[PDB]
A paper describes a structure:
Plant vitamin C biosynthetic pathway contains conversion of D-mannose-1-phosphate (Man-1-P) to GDP-D-mannose (GDP-Man), a step catalyzed by the Man-1-P guanylyltransferase which is commonly named GDP-Man pyrophosphorylase (GMPase). Arabidopsis thaliana VTC1 is the first genetically characterized plant GMPase and has unique properties when compared with bacterial and animal homologs. Structures of two GMPases have been reported, which are the crystal structure of GMPase from the hyperthermophilic bacterium Thermotoga maritima (TmGMP) and the cryo-EM structure of human GMPase (GMPPA-GMPPB complex) that is arranged into a dodecamer. These structures show that an oligomer-forming monomer (protomer) of GMPase consists of two domains: an N-terminal Rossmann fold-like domain and a C-terminal left-handed β-helix (LβH) domain. VTC1 dimerizes via its LβH domain and forms a dodecamer in crystal.
Numbering used by the authors: 1 to 357
Write the structure that this text describes.
């Protein structure tokens, strides 16, 4: 069983984190986003996963080598010259997706975090015998998305309404696709969109079916939705496997701590914090609604809220970091510095206060 992961560009919207490692390798909940998906794809019997990227994948060849051996799965890159959209890459890598068994293949948005009911979706797709199945999830602002209009008694999709000024529903594209090989005959090797060009073709032939996604969903493509997705994901661990969440008198809410991380005495971590491997959180540190990536040090008495601290960064003593601050890799914030939404490029030294760029 084959699978495709739609990456596209390196991800400007996640700068400066993506300036060091492209979008599918940025950490989410102590794991690179690629792991969350491949672990899920492997659990349904996927043996090869094609990565549809826009950048040169040589920058991530050393990481994927190790991930292929540990996860026992084939990862093949499929780079595009010009941006082919979300359906275009399906044609560019049609040779790597067709294996002759006529079996359907999975397609995933590289920035979608969920519980991935891929087993439950396999049985859904084979029941109605349609050409393509997509996952659907409900949101609060469907006017900002393309809303699905589906025959809810059967699941058959009639049409997609892009950015409806008037309410026609609240179910949107959840980014999880299950497509038969025949779909690849409806996509030319040009920039085409699967939701606005390919799906209407299948929606006309009455071969498009939608399955409501049971569980949380979030596209962490941008920083605001990244923090939101971390909260929804951590509460999923609270509901599913609470043993993975940490606990103690210094813990409020749901906190995920890597076993190789150091937590100093007298801290207060939470709610909704993810601390990565090799992190040194010194004594008396306040952390909430933030992500601390691999190898960053938070010196004593610092307070961090609603922020993302890039790999191997260093927050000085009594520093104040809040309001959607994003430190890149290897950023050294000095003591007592105040960041109100600072966006610091990698390897920089922050010696004075910074605000929103």
């Amino acid at each position: 069983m084959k699978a495709l992961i739609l990456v596209g560009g390196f991800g400007t919207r996640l700068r400066p984190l993506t300036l060091s490692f492209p979008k599918p390798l940025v950490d989410f909940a102590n794991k690179p986003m690629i792991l969350h998906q491949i672990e899920a794809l492997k659990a349904v019997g996927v043996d090869e996963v094609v990565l549809a990227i826009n950048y040169q994948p040589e920058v991530m060849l050393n990481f994927l080598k190790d991930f292929e051996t540990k996860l026992e799965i084939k990862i093949t890159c499929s780079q595009e010259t010009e941006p082919l959209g979300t359906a275009g890459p399906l044609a560019l890598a049609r040779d790597k997706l067709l294996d002759g068994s006529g079996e359907p293949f999975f397609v995933l948005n590289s920035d979608v975090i969920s519980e991935y009911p891929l087993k439950e979706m396999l049985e859904f797709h084979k029941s109605h015998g349609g050409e393509a199945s997509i996952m659907v999830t409900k949101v609060d602002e469907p006017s900002k998305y393309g809303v699905v209009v589906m025959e809810e008694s059967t699941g058959r999709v009639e049409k997609f309404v892009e950015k409806p000024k008037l309410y026609v529903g609240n179910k949107i594209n959840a980014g999880i696709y299950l497509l038969n090989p025949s779909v690849l005959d409806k996509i030319e090797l040009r920039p085409t969109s699967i939701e606005k060009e390919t799906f209407p073709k299948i929606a006309a032939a009455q071969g498009l079916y939608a399955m409501v996604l049971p569980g949380f969903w979030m596209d962490i493509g941008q920083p605001r939705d990244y923090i939101t997705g971390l909260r929804l994901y951590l509460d999923s661990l609270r509901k599913k496997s609470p043993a993975k969440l940490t606990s103690g008198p210094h813990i409020v809410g749901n906190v995920l701590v890597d076993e190789t991380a150091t937590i100093g005495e007298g801290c207060l971590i939470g709610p909704d914090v993810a601390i990565g491997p090799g992190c040194i959180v010194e004594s008396g540190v306040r952390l909430s609604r933030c992500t601390v990536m691999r190898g960053v040090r938070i010196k004593k008495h610092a307070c961090i809220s609603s922020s993302i601290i890039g790999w191997h960064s260093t927050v000085g003593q009594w520093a104040r970091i809040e309001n959607m601050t994003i430190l890149g890799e290897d950023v050294h914030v000095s003591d007592e510095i105040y960041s109100n939404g600072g966006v610091v490029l990698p390897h920089k030294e922050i010696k004075s206060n910074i605000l929103k760029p």
